[PDB]
């Protein structure tokens, strides 16, 4: 069961000794982030471990990281680890490979430009207002407030409107079908029984595909596929992502088909829905446990936007401390945790040989808390991202959205989305720890970056 | 079960309608060659069928064939269909892929040059003499002679000597270990229960690999691996392929390792052993059923080599009619039957779109018997390959060894090998049909190009 478990001993590369068949997976008992920090401390700048029989080489040298994510991206490090069983969701850009990915990224890039994002800001702003009305009703009843729920509704509202023109107050229609289905598109727990097993028996992935078993719930995807097929034909008569993609089908590429279009629509929901609500919850925890930060930010918002003035695209990008608070929260909680690329050819990068087929992994969470780059890394200190101090911040250490050609395509949208929500809420409310607030917050031990206990806070109206 | 069975209907490409899950495999009941001839006649110049869910596109236009095998070989059509479970035999050049194959073909090409072949001719000639002595003893007892056995011993003798310096009279030591093991390296029956099942459930191949199940008998390969490891270290103190490969390990490539070297040694045995004896048996059938051909050839040998003179490299290549007889036999019996390349990128070749992942198949057997290139294709007529008529012979229709960069690397060796045997035997014997000779010879219905009944003939001494 150790066909390939001698690879890192041969390369003279250090690392935790793997068990037969399991490789190192038993060390995931404390989750991805703990394993990566320990390996970093124990073994230093480079190490290896085995996901079953798959060798994973962790790298932490920023130059080596830039080779992987930027320099040799197209040549050597184009793809991520095979992810399935996926079915027709194989055509989603985040899952595609090589030339198919290159085409899809090209066909989809114009959809995410700052110009398009600016055009979508009025829609996103509408649902900040929906958020405040629903936040107030819970602020008007002295009842603690679980963040993930209120931001969940908000993220849902943004998604349905910006991707399909569906305009729903999802917290108050939690049971409309379109909410009912998209609500199921959550982050995957890559350490749950299923996804672990796929690591111990990946030779079982093609078997699942042949049985039409898919990691994306088949009902939800079918619901959306016909819904998209319905909208596409209704709009044909008489801003949203769907319309942008429909427009792109009217031109040097082949063009995206109808099924390629549905796969993007689904993957954007999946990428944005629970991620956005998770970060917003982490941000609010940091504000409630750091009231001066919350006060200073509330004063900054009030300066750019007096009389609780509605935020716009340009005023959002005017707010520095807002940017610093968002970025410092993404440093402590980089919710993807790791970046990965498959090494597709025998190569050598900055004087290290990398055998074809190794997964090169960048442990983002662990680097965000490295003392060798971040003083007092455990503390929420937004000053690190001040305009004076950002020059010493290495874009290859801080990678909440990845880097290079395969970085998060939704990065700009997601930052603007979250900033719009924080502005509107903070113009209206302050956020206070309850007795039931977990302090300090503790991270879950599974394959998701989330708190052990849900974040619950007091929400008082600024009247 | 028809995820991909609509591909050829979408491309407007004709072909036999596939069953769910099986694709078209049930049409292999009469073997590869019959299926290909029928499809050719029925559907014309291009058609499709499904090996389970794998789409296979047959092409017959010589220009399109040259694009596949020569023009876009490195760019698009580099690999054959995945073949496994193979274990460490994955490093054999005939199984390797992409850059690994390119390297191995480069590292091995100098081993097959005309210069090396000429140096090996004296060894091969020695076993022609062993052949004649063993043929005579069966010619001296008026007993019919099964060809595959006598040529089998000969092909075995050539292999052990040219690849390892092992010099054995294998017909008379049929039970020495080195014969015992290599005797098991026969052609695969790609239509037998196992290899069919791998076509209906190829998702089961990775499963077999994880269980260390291999299509090459594990005992034989282990026997040879240590035998090679033993010889490598004995020769180190105090012509063969092994020595040529050992020498290559002493130099712009990485160099072939010890295990890469063993994999070549094994694959060359496997490629040469039963193929050479099969063709030699087909040739002798054609001579016995065409005595004038046999007479004319025997007179040609006697002219170049008077007094039963031993053949040499240069006199072999002097014999035209010998060449014509060998080539006409390889036209009627091209024992690989088909050539294949995986289309690795969405491409278009001579105005036909080919989707990535399709297997492009060239049906060699069917083209060797096409009336649109070969008059009276069923008859053994060596005149087609006369120096006058060879100018109308299209190197992309006649492909007994394939074409392009991925053609049979052993072609020159195998022709010389067989020619040396035919010369020595025909200098000494004539070959006559017995009552028990199957006439006309009928091909087996399995996944091997072989006669239904074994070829048995009378062998009289020319004294
Ligand atoms: C705060 C929310 C989000 C975070 C932290 C985040 C983070 C990331 C990260 C770390 C990656 C991997 C980057 C790499 O491999 O270098 C990624 C990829 C990606 N993200 Fe996000 N993301 C977020 C929201 C979104 C949104 C709203 C979208 C909407 C379209 C989106 C679409 C994608 C896609 C399509 C990819 C794959 C890109 C490719 O393979 O070419 N993400 N994201
Ligand atoms: C009469 C005997 C033989 C015949 C008819 C034959 C025929 C063929 C054919 C049709 C192919 C496929 C070519 C293509 O895909 O274009 C091939 C490949 C090959 N043959 Fe043979 N062959 C014979 C004997 C040998 C021998 C004696 C060797 C000894 C080394 C050998 C080694 C190979 C190898 C290594 C390949 C794969 C080449 C590559 O993938 O680069 N064969 N042969
Ligand atoms: O898995 C992703 C990151 N990723 C994208 N391709 C490969 N990995 C999906 N995703 C992309 N944008 C948003 N989500 C992820 C999973 C969990 C998470 F918290 C963030 C995160 F990026
Ligand atoms: O399968 C082969 C041809 N081939 C090589 N790579 C892929 N296919 C093996 N082989 C190569 N030289 C000799 N044998 C074959 C099988 C049967 C046969 F009769 C000929 C034949 F070439």
From Swiss-Prot, chains A, B:
Cofactor: heme
Listed result of changing residue 382 to L: In allele CYP3A4*13; lack of expression
Outcome reported for the amino acid change (mutating residue 31 to D): In allele CYP3A4*7
PTM section of the record: Polyubiquitinated in the presence of AMFR and UBE2G1 and also STUB1/CHIP and UBE2D1 (in vitro).
GO molecular function: 1,8-cineole 2-exo-monooxygenase activity; 1-alpha,25-dihydroxyvitamin D3 23-hydroxylase activity; anandamide 11,12 epoxidase activity; anandamide 14,15 epoxidase activity; anandamide 8,9 epoxidase activity; caffeine oxidase activity; enzyme binding; estrogen 16-alpha-hydroxylase activity
PROSITE patterns from the UniProt entry: CYTOCHROME_P450
Consequence recorded when altering residue 339 to F: In allele CYP3A4*12; has an altered testosterone hydroxylase activity
CDD domains for this protein: CYP3A (cd20650)
Compartments where found: Endoplasmic reticulum membrane; Microsome membrane
Protein's pathway: Steroid hormone biosynthesis; Cofactor metabolism; retinol metabolism; Steroid metabolism; cholesterol metabolism; Lipid metabolism; fatty acid metabolism
Note, other: Chimeric transcripts, characterized by CYP3A43 exon 1 joined at canonical splice sites to distinct sets of CYP3A4 exons, have been detected. All are possibly produced by trans-splicing. The chimeric transcripts exist in 3 different combinations: CYP3A43 exon 1 joined in frame to CYP3A4 exons 2-13, CYP3A43 exon 1 joined in frame to CYP3A4 exons 4-13 and CYP3A43 exon 1 joined in frame to CYP3A4 exon 7-13. The longest chimeric isoform (CYP3A43 exon 1 joined to CYP3A4 exons 2-13) exhibits 6-beta-hydroxylase activity, while a shorter isoform (CYP3A43 exon 1 joined to CYP3A4 exons 4-13) does not.
Associated clinical condition: Vitamin D-dependent rickets 3: An autosomal dominant disorder of vitamin D metabolism resulting in early-onset rickets, reduced serum levels of the vitamin D metabolites 25-hydroxyvitamin D and 1,25-dihydroxyvitamin D, and deficient responsiveness to parent and activated forms of vitamin D.
Protein name: Cytochrome P450 3A4
Organism: Homo sapiens (Human)
Name of the encoding gene: CYP3A4
């Amino acid at each position: 069961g150790t066909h390939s478990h001698g690879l890192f001993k041969k390369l003279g590369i250090p690392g935790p000794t793997p068990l037969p068949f399991l490789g190192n997976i038993l060390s995931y008992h404390k989750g991805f982030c703990m394993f990566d920090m320990e390996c970093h401390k124990k073994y230093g700048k480079v190490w290896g471990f085995y996901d079953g029989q798959q060798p994973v080489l962790a790298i932490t040298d920023p130059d080596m990281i830039k080779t992987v994510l930027v320099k040799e991206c197209y040549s050597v490090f184009t793809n991520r680890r095979p992810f399935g069983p996926v079915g027709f969701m194989k055509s989603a850009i985040s899952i595609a490979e090589d030339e198919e990915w290159k085409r899809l990224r090209s066909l989809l890039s114009p959809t995410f430009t700052s110009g398009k994002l600016k055009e979508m800001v009025p829609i996103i702003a509408q649902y900040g207002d929906v958020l405040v009305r629903n936040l107030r009703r819970e602020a008007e009843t002295g009842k603690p407030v679980t963040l993930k729920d209120v931001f969940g509704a908000y993220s849902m509202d943004v998604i349905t409107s910006t991707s399909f023109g569906v305009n729903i107050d999802s917290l108050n229609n939690p049971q409309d079908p379109f909410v009912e289905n998209t609500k199921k598109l959550l982050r995957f727990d890559f350490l749950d029984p299923f996804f672990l097993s796929i690591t111990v028996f990946p030779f079982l992935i093609p078997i699942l595909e042949v049985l039409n078993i898919c990691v994306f719930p088949r009902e939800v995807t079918n619901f959306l596929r016909k819904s998209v097929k319905r909208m596409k034909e209704s709009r044909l008569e008489d801003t949203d992502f769907l319309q942008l993609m429909i427009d792109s089908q009217n031109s040097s590429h082949k063009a995206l088909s109808d099924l390629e279009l549905v796969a993007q629509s689904i993957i954007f929901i999946f990428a944005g829905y629970e991620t956005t609500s998770s970060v917003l919850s982490f941000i609010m925890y940091e504000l409630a446990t750091h009231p001066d930060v919350q006060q200073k930010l509330q004063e900054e918002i009030d300066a750019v936007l007096p009389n609780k003035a509605p935020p716009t695209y340009d005023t959002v990008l005017q707010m520095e401390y807002l940017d610093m608070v968002v970025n410092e929260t993404l440093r402590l909680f980089p919710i993807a945790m790791r970046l990965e690329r498959v090494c597709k050819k025998d190569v050598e990068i900055n004087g290290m040989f990398i055998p074809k087929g190794v997964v090169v992994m960048i442990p983002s969470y662990a680097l965000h808390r490295d003392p060798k780059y971040w003083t007092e890394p455990e503390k929420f200190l937004p000053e690190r991202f001040s305009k004076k101090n950002k020059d010493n911040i290495d874009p290859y250490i801080y990678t909440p959205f990845g880097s290079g050609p395969r970085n998060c395509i939704g990065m700009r949208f997601a930052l603007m989305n979250m900033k719009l929500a924080l502005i509107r809420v903070l113009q209206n409310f302050s956020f206070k720890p309850c007795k039931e607030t977990q302090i300090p917050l503790k991270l879950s031990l599974g394959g998701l970056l989330q708190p052990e206990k849900p974040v619950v806070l007091k929400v008082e109206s600024r009247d």
